[PDB]
Write a protein that binds this DNA or RNA. Sequence first.
RNA 1: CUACGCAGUG
RNA 2: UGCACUGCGUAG
RNA 3: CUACGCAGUG
RNA 4: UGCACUGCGUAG
Lengths: 81, 81, 814, 814, 62, 62
Amino acid sequence: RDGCVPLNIIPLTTAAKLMVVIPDYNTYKNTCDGTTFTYASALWEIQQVVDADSKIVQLSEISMDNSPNLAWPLIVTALRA
Amino acid sequence: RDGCVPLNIIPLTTAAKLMVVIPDYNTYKNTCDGTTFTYASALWEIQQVVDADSKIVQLSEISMDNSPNLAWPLIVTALRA
Amino acid sequence: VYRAFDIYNDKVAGFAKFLKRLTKYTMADLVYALRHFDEGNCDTLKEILVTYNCCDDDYFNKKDWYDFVENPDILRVYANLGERVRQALLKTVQFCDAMRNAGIVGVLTLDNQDLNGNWYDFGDFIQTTPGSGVPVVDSYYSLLMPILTLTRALTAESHVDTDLTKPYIKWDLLKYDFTEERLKLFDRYFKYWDQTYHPNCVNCLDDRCILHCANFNVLFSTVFPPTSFGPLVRKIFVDGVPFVVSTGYHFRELGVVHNQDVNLSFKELLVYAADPAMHAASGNLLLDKRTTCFSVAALTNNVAFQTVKPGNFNKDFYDFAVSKGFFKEGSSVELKHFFFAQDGNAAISDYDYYRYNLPTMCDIRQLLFVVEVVDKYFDCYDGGCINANQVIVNNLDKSAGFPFNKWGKARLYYDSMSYEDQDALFAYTKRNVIPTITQMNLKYAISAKNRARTVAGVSICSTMTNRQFHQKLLKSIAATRGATVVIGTSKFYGGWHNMLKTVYSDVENPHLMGWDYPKCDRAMPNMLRIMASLVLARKHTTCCSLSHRFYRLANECAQVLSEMVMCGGSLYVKPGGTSSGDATTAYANSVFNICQAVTANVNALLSTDGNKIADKYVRNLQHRLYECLYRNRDVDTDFVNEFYAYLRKHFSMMILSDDAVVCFNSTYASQGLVASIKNFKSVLYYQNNVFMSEAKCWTETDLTKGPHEFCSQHTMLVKQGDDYVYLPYPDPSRILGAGCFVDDIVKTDGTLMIERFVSLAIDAYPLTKHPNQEYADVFHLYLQYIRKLHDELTDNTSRYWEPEFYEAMYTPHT
Amino acid sequence: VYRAFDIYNDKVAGFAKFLKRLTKYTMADLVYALRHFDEGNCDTLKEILVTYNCCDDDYFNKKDWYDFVENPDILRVYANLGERVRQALLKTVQFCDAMRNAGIVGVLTLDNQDLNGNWYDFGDFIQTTPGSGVPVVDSYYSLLMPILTLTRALTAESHVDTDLTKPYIKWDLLKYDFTEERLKLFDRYFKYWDQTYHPNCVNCLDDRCILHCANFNVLFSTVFPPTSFGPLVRKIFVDGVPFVVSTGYHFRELGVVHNQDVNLSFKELLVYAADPAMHAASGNLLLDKRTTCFSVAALTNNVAFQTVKPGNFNKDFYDFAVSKGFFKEGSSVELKHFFFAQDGNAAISDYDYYRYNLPTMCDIRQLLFVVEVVDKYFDCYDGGCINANQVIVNNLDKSAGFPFNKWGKARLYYDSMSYEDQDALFAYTKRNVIPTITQMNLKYAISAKNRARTVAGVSICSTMTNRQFHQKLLKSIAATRGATVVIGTSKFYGGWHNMLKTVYSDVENPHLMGWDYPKCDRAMPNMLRIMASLVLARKHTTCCSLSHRFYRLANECAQVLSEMVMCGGSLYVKPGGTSSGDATTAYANSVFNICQAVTANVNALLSTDGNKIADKYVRNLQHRLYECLYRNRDVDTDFVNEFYAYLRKHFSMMILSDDAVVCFNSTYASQGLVASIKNFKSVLYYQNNVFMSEAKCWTETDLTKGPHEFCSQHTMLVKQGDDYVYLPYPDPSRILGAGCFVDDIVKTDGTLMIERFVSLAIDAYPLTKHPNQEYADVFHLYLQYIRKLHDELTDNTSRYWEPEFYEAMYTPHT
Amino acid sequence: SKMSDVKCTSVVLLSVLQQLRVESSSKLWAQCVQLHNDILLAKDTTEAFEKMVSLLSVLLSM
Amino acid sequence: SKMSDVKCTSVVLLSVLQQLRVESSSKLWAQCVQLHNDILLAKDTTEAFEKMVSLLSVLLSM
RNA sequence: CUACGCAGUG
RNA sequence: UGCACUGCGUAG
RNA sequence: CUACGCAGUG
RNA sequence: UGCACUGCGUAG
Ligand SMILES: [Zn+2]
Ligand SMILES: [Zn+2]
Ligand SMILES: [Zn+2]
Ligand SMILES: [Zn+2]
């Protein structure tokens, strides 16, 4: 009505790309375990998962068994569905 | 008279070149301190002095002050005078 | 046995412990326990917590359970009681209503309300005309204010129908104005608080009104969603092209503020660039689980991790020291200072410490009296607004901040802006709020602890405006000698002795104390920072109007208190605290220290029994303190003067921006008339939300020895020219580490080493008079190393290795 | 009190201590002290040394003063007495002359001559026709022989007019024949030694005559200049071109030997190449002060220094062992075996140890009886000369020596020479002496001590000729079971138990001893090596004549005893000792060990009082031993048989080339009838010129435990198939070091590791039955590592990690 | 003393490791930094030697 | 244990030093060999660590 | 039995 | 980069 | 006094 | 690669 909106909400409802930083595998399963997840009342489908060294970590490699071999934190980039 | 001579004495009285191995500077001053020395009842004048690394050590460098900096033993080659 | 009572009468007054169905404990007991906290005596607090199912006895078996930093889970335990407190508040209102309906006039005290919220007092109640009852709730509410935030009483307000079980309220994401909600909360909870409350501080009559409204807003803001707060932005047309520009700000303390010159040049370009609106709009959404702080957006496609390189090692100096007999086995002097390398997650981890900043509501009457007293410590100084041509900048080659660091240094922007442009920007800041972005940078320096240290580089515009606003007062403070604040006073040429003599001035039974602030820069309450800003700005009575001063305060809050933080390509919202790169960092912290000391003294005086006090003057002083605290609105200048004189006589303070050395009377402190270490611990507990350990605090019984530590320097009494003087010396380990380890290899060797070692020798000379022989030998080692460096490099230079040059530096001739 | 006496009569005989102007001490006392040496009881020796100014009492304060290796300066102290001894000898001759002039027949004993040389005995002297007196000096001279070389009595003979003060005699450098000087010395010193003395052993009647003449030549050669000894060479014309070729040899023991086929083909080419004459003639003069050994020449323009590389480390096995619980803190099993790297001066330094070889003159009668007894230990074996086609060479890819190593390996030369050519070379060696050059090579192997080890690679011609000469006997010895020498007897399949049972055979009160030879290969006297060579060659009675056998002995001496040594491009003259690369290295050392044991037993029996002996048989045996030793020339076969039977009954020996395990009777050893450790120490002192420490010697009281150590293996008694057997196990540290560290990285990993670890497991299996649990766990660790290696590489291979394969290796089935 | 020179050796080893571009790998850099910081703050000589040996092994591996 | 792995580290350091043509210089090789041999024969852990540090410094110098 | 390689012992 | 002994593994 | 560089303090 | 204070060194 007034035309004024908080700045913080602009990226939330208008950002096409989402980047999530994962410190450990526990937060990984909690937040974005699958290829598609829900955040900020929106559905995001994953496009890429890189490590701290900027290497392309695949979805299959992410697991409890192979977690010690990953350069955490993991940066996961997804696009709005 | 018999024509037979010991083998060991042949190099002593017939070798034109003499090589002396010096373990330390004390034996150096004892045996061949100067440019010319006496050994086997013969006068030998020094031609070269190398170190354990096959480097050309000069006569001036050989001294008590610089002895620790020399790669002993020292091989001194001289010619019969 | 002893129960807490808040008493007022002719004979005695104060809030203290006295020997004097219903529950065992009252609300006064809880308030006293949470406001006078001593780990040695926590029986009442433990019993209250256990009885009401806040926690179990086993919780107390764990050590450091009370500490917030070591055991943050304690915050949860206290929260278990908050709901109960909330209920009491509601009941209180009901009681008041009944009195108003019964024509009853009386004073409500915390000690007459049980922890179940029931009021069982019918004394001091005098019948009047029905409907005309006017209860007094100043003491009750004012004393209960600190507990409300610690226990998070109003958490239920975040749920539908104010029920914890039912889901949370889903506010509109675009909503940012909660004025009606603030009025509704104030009416439901603080209905009978007669003082007018302004949700928006734009409509505050004066600085005290601003403090009152901000104190209430701190409590009220916890209910509202975090996303609502922050810069307010609009989409506008400029030059036939669309731009998103900030046109307002929502402050958790000051409410909604709208820019007065909103419309739809170099000044405008910098205003737009510094504004985080464009950066956030063009930035991708970010969710960072590495911290509990709010995440705004990401300006970079990939996250950035910064590491701290290891320190360089000077083999020449270490070998020289070893050859001369240092660094032996069992030697007292050892290397304990190093450069500690850090991983890529260090910087963000440091930012995570901002989690220790919590919403804290202060005792408003106590804060008002304390700020009035503190203003006396800054009366001698003069301040005001100055023009651009009167601004002095020490270094023009420093960083201009984000995004200004991309294009050049501060020199570029200072040269680009003419004096008229800078004045125009300053006047604009007097009418509008300019949010800015502050970068977090790891600092590369010596330390004896492995923790990384971060500094906040603020934007160029904020630095320029704050300089024009505050530099006059800041320079006035730095040029004053003999005052409580000792910024600008050199320790050399007898300055240390002069300062120490000033501190000891006229104390009957002097002892010395010194304390520490755990996580000072991070855990500082926002209210205290606002109070310090108001104290600094009170020098602008003539050159600025009320609106101008309020807008300057709002700009400072939006650029210092809750600005936007740039960390590794990501934007975050700072919960609160103080930034280290501010134009007023040292002086605001000095004001905070003085405020904490005054609060501790006030708490100590009121916590005393009063009847036991055998001094009529002190008893009258306590009675008048209570009067001016919980019974009188207008500032009593005479009593403020008297209390300031009392503190100066019995409480002499030397403050440098974090570090305090206090000379205090023996008997008065013993009898509770003057604050002790325990009072400071309690104040830091219920105000600063941090636990102060006695290990980091020191007390010196004898003045001859001097302060144990001040600015990392210890004190010795030495004989110079038939006169005994106080001389500061540093820890030998720090100097040795500085000599051995260097920032970069550029300063590893050469002529530049001469200056570094000369400075180190200047600092370390006082170790010659120390009884320990190795401490003295450190200085001779430094001198001999300077000699050796000069020899390697190879008349006046003789003075460098002759000790007369260093002798002269500590004599009072200059 | 007790004084040394040499007594002979019907009642008792022997040289022992008895309770029975003139000096306090006699020559017999000195001989007894120097021949029966015990550090615990050296009072007589110390008093003799001090009284005659040989040394001071403070000399005895220093520990290990007696030891030659630790304190070589002792050799000087003894030398201070030599002159005195020399004087005595001269006086003795005079005395004899007087007797011959007085017609007196009597026996001269060492105990009747004082240390001043005067003879004070006039008993047992019977008047006869004047000029017909014939004194008996067998016992005197024979007992005094060992002292002469130790004290260097004849040193004065190296000075003009036999005066130490006056300068040394300057002999002609070209002179090499000293036959007249030898006759003159023998006539002046041993005038009345009735046995004929041949300075040149070419004219010796038999092996005993050769030993006698060589014993005298050892003493006589010390006078003559060292340069005189060595190969004799001539300049000759061959094919119209001049060549320098060896035509004779001067041996310090055998005198001058001239080749019989001197004249002025492949065989001739090898004879010339192996001859050091050409190399020395074409080599430059060399003076090397790094050693006390003689320097001949340098074949290289620059000296060469060789270094030992460090051992390779197997990370897989060490990590596996660590993971399984080994190499922990305080564990009994630890890594004590490594590859020790060496500098460039190591090899020559090792050669310097040849300084411990000294000219030693033996008691000729004792040596003759000892060799006769020792021959009995080799009677079962058969030997002789074989043809080229009957020679077996284990490895043909070994080094051929200098200069043959330049052109190829031993295979090249064996293929080049046809059987007829090899037979021709062997026949030539039966008529002429072929000096050869032996190279010194550092050996790369595991050790628990930092000292480097050297091996002597002999020339191809010497190896071929010695093989044709000795291989028949050597193979006969290696194929014999149940004999004293246990070369060729496998420890596996119950061999250890069989050997131990053989040693224990028929001992009344058995105890076990084992001893060590300090610097055995370097300090071995030349006389003992010659005796061992003669013992080995005595199997050639039918196939070789006296001249052929003597020339073979001369070739062996010129190629083994005092050959030319090639070290780092320099030629040196080996003072003596034994080379480790000989065709008869192990067997010659076994002969030496048996000889030392027999000498110790003889000394023990004669040193006994005799009167105290309560056994008539033992007393008669001692009397007949003295008779056959110092009174009878011809060998008494019956008494040799009886003494051999006595030793076998009461002294059971198991000898492998350095290592001896002896089962001996309790009571006989206690009473002195059989040799003890002290007797071996004394023998090694006065014969081997080395001190034997009791730490390296072991004595086992109980047979069930078994020998403490044999061939680096310890013994356990274990239960196998209802039968208790003796089982050898190694030190776990050695096996673990072998597993962890490897020679080269080629064998670091792969299939080749399987064989190495299988062999190590075979060796280490016996540790399973050890009471210590870690010792057993070593074998399981090895088996599990073999499993892991097989898994990494990836039915029959199962046997490698199944313990039945290693079980089978130690059962008596095969 | 051995403790001080061990600390100096650890500092220089970390410096050379950083100059070897070890910081490109996140986990290896984290391990090296942790080891170095523990060495500096270590009060027991044996633990300091163990950590120095570990860091030197890290360097030797490459 | 620290003693055994210190010995192994010394052995491998000497091996790599030898592979670095250190043996060309006589005195440096002599010092390295002496240090390594003492480390192997050392019975005190502190002395072994000191000698290992010295040898590692020798390697680091080049 | 022979050829090759390996391990241990003196 | 030596002389012997012993025991293993791969082809015949 | 100004320009540059360095060191310490919060 | 921050805001202040203090003290040094080199040019004017
Ligand atoms: Zn207001
Ligand atoms: Zn103003
Ligand atoms: Zn003869
Ligand atoms: Zn024969």
